[PDB]
Amino acid sequence: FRILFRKLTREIYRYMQRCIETDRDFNLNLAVKSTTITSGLKYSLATGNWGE
């Protein structure tokens, strides 16, 4: 979860830059790719490899 969340906190930055220049009325519910912490756990528990 540390790994997957360290690749969660950052995709907020990497989307609130493409919209910060437009300064649009960002929904903020579309920059949070929620399946971030689904697939790492799914692959670690299914395939058996604890990582990405």
């Binding site: 906190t9 907020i12 930055y13 609130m16 830059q17 910060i20 300064d23």
Partner: peptide
């Protein structure tokens, strides 16, 4: 890490 800051200086 409970702090996320952006800016437009």
């Amino acid at each position: 890490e409970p702090r996320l800051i952006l800016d437009q200086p």
